[PDB]
């Protein structure tokens, strides 16, 4: 039986992660613990970042120094008003299990914590302006998770060194998941005072981002939605390349499921007014079918092409992104 501290870590994983708990807990051998802890560490970091009761000036050191707290066995944070605060109040349990991991895993995890902290700190006194800056934000909060996971898979030796070495491909995997979430969660974020859509894009349509929540502005909102989805789709060639290299079945499933869930969510969101009224989600019955079929590369490719064709045939004649949307979809189909 596992140590009591590790049991506690898996308890926190199941409490806090809806999307990832199952796939993580199905990982083979040494990957399971490495990735459970990687998750919890980053989830604590995020809980700090998310917390708007922590002033910027106080938040900046906490984010910068977070990587170092992993080696301070009594470090915890008692001022969080976030839902996942337990992760911060009992951080010593998480950091004890982290220090129990092989050095080769510790190094990757701490390195990712350090870099994500710097990047999170950088976006505390600005929003996202350009599409380039959108890519940068997404790299800090998601791309680096992909790079982190990739390097862990390689360190365990269940996967070839190439998986951990190709940082662009791993970065794209994270970007695709993150843009999908940001696109889909427009309203939830607007209601909580958060703004993640790029300013240089939305500003061509409305004067304030929240203006897309107003019913009179729906035609413009959906145009902006379509332009941002088109942006996200450009990461799919790299997604296909990344998944095409994976050898371990448990690692294949962990990587592929969230990607095909995000592909399904993007297609559900395309040209969809409902994004501006509430949370658009793929039906649970369909989610089950995707989890079952996405176990090999050719079946993943089929799912991708299927959802691309769904989008393609829903492009409105007058959509200002239409030519771009067709172009990227073709690229995906022919690769």
Ligand X SMILES: CC(C)=CCC/C(C)=C/CC/C(C)=C/[C@@H]1[C@@H](COP(=O)(O)OP(=O)(O)O)[C@]1(C)CC/C=C(\C)CCC=C(C)C
Judged by the rule CB under 5 A, the positions of this chain that interact with Mg ion are 46, 49-50
- The answer to the question of residue 250 lying near ligand X (CB under 6 A) is no
Start-to-end C-alpha separation, the chain: 47
From the list Mg ion, ligand X, none, which binds 49 (C-beta under 5 to 8 Å, kind-based)?
Answer: Mg ion
- How many other CB atoms are there within 10 angstroms of residue 292's CB atom? 9
From the list Mg ion, ligand X, none, which binds 253 (C-beta under 5 to 8 Å, kind-based)?
Answer: none
Secondary structure of 40-94 in HEC code, one letter for each residue: HHHHHHHHHHHCCCCCHHHHHHHHHCHHHHCCCCCCCCCCCCCCCCHHHHCHHHH
Spatial separation of the C-alpha atoms in residues 173 and 156, rounded to whole Å: 20
For Cα atoms 181, 236, 291, give the angle at the middle one, nearest 5 degrees: 65
Identified binder of ligand X from the candidate list 65, 100, 129, 181, rule CB under 6 A = 181
Identified binder of ligand X from the candidate list 17, 154, 156, 223, rule CB under 6 A = 17
> Does 43 appear as a known binding residue?
yes
> Does 46 appear as a known binding residue?
yes
Contact region for ligand X (CB under 6 A) — 15-23, 100-108, 205-213, 322-330? 15-23
Contact region for ligand X (CB under 6 A) — 50-58, 117-125, 169-177, 274-282? 169-177
CB contact at 8 A, 225 and 247? no
> Does 51 appear as a known binding residue?
no
- The answer to the question of residue 39 lying near ligand X (CB under 6 A) is yes
Identified binder of ligand X from the candidate list 34, 37, 42, 183, rule CB under 6 A = 42
> Does 50 appear as a known binding residue?
yes
Q: How far is CA 331 from CA 39, 163, 237, 238, 325, in A?
A: 33, 23, 8, 11, 10
The secondary structure of 156-215 as a DSSP string is: HTSS-HHHHH-HHHHHHHHHHHHHHHHHHTHHHHHHTT---S-HHHHTTT-SSGGGGGSG
CB contact at 8 A, 98 and 109? yes
Instruction: Write out the E strands in the chain.
Output: none
> Does 184 appear as a known binding residue?
yes
- The answer to the question of residue 284 lying near ligand X (CB under 6 A) is no
Q: For residue 310, what are its two tokens? A: 């769904």
In the complex, what is the shortest distance from the CB of residue 254 to ligand X, in angstroms, rounded to a whole number?
5
From the list Mg ion, ligand X, none, which binds 150 (C-beta under 5 to 8 Å, kind-based)?
Answer: ligand X
Identified binder of ligand X from the candidate list 37, 87, 228, 254, rule CB under 6 A = 254
- The answer to the question of residue 123 lying near ligand X (CB under 6 A) is no
- The answer to the question of residue 18 lying near ligand X (CB under 6 A) is yes
Residues that bind ligand X (CB under 6 A): 17-20, 23-24, 35, 38-39, 42-43, 46, 142, 145-146, 149-150, 170, 173-174, 177-178, 181, 254-255, 258
Which residues fall in the annotated binding site for Mg(2+)? 46, 49-50
């Amino acid at each position: 039986s596992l140590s009591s501290s590790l049991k506690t870590c898996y308890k926190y994983l199941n409490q806090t992660s809806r999307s990832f708990a199952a796939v993580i807990q199905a990982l083979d051998g040494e990957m399971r613990n490495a990735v459970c802890i990687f998750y919890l560490v980053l989830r604590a970091l995020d809980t700090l970042e998310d917390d708007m009761t922590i002033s910027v000036e106080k938040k900046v050191p906490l984010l910068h120094n977070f990587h170092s707290f992993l080696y301070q066995p009594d470090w915890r944070f008692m001022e969080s008003k976030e839902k996942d605060r337990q992760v911060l109040e009992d951080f010593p349990t998480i950091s004890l299990e982290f220090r129990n991991l092989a050095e080769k895993y510790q190094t990757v995890i701490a390195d990712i914590c350090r870099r994500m902290g710097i990047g999170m700190a950088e976006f505390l006194d600005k929003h996202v302006t350009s599409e380039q800056e959108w890519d940068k934000y997404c790299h800090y909060v998601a791309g680096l998770v992909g790079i982190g996971l990739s390097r862990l898979f390689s360190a365990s030796e269940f996967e070839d060194p190439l998986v951990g070495e190709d940082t662009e491909r791993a970065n794209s995997m994270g970007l695709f998941l993150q843009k999908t979430n940001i696109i889909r969660d427009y309203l939830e974020d607007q209601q909580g005072g958060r703004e993640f859509w790029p300013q240089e894009v939305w500003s061509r349509y409305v004067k304030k981002l929240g203006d897309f929540a107003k019913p009179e502005n729906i035609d413009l909102a959906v145009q902006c939605l379509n332009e941002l989805i088109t942006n996200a789709l450009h990461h799919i060639p790299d997604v296909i390349t990344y998944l095409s290299r994976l050898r371990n079945q448990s690692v294949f499933n962990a990587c592929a499921i969230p990607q095909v869930m995000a592909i399904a969510t993007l297609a559900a969101c395309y040209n969809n007014q409902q994004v501006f009224k509430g949370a658009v989600k793929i039906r649970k019955g369909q989610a089950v079918t995707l989890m079952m079929d996405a176990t090999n590369m050719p079946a993943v490719k089929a799912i991708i092409y299927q959802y691309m064709e769904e989008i393609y045939h829903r492009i409105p004649d007058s959509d200002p992104s239409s030519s771009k949307t067709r172009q990227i979809i073709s690229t995906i189909r022919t690769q």
